């Protein structure tokens with residue numbers, strides 16, 4: 001939204017628009033992606049351009065780049081908030097919330113649950129059935145429908 005945000009987003013855009021013509025080609029995108037230690041396929045590059053290319057003209061302009069960037073920033077903010085909450089649940093940092101971690105967290109907060117109840121909570125959220133709650137499960141359990 002801000003003139004300041006748009007200047008910052010114009011700054012990011014320029015790194016992609018290697019020749020300064022106001023558009024990003026699949027090539028340019030590739031150059032940038034390689035310079036970041038990535039080797040995307042030609043098909044991956046086209047997909048990424050296709051996903052941003054609102055007008056379908058084959059390249060991405062700054063207006064299209066602003067739309068994409070403003071969404072990516074809302075997504076990232078959201079991922080960083082859910083993630084900081086997952087790190088709090090996951091005491092020993094192994095990437096999984098256990099029944100004992102969940103119980104301890106509710107209890108330090110105040111709300112005491114039994115092992116029975118905590119096990120039910122883990123089972124509800126444990127999509128892949130590994131007895132624990134990974135990040136993807138934790139995000140889904142905040143959503144479900």
Ligand SMILES: [Ca+2]
Pocket residue numbers: 016017018019020021022023024025028
């Ligand atoms: Ca260009």
Ligand SMILES: [Ca+2]
Pocket residue numbers: 053054055056057058059060061064
């Ligand atoms: Ca376009």
Ligand SMILES: [Ca+2]
Pocket residue numbers: 090091092093094095096097098101
């Ligand atoms: Ca853990």
Ligand SMILES: [Ca+2]
Pocket residue numbers: 125126127128129130131132133134137
């Ligand atoms: Ca699981």
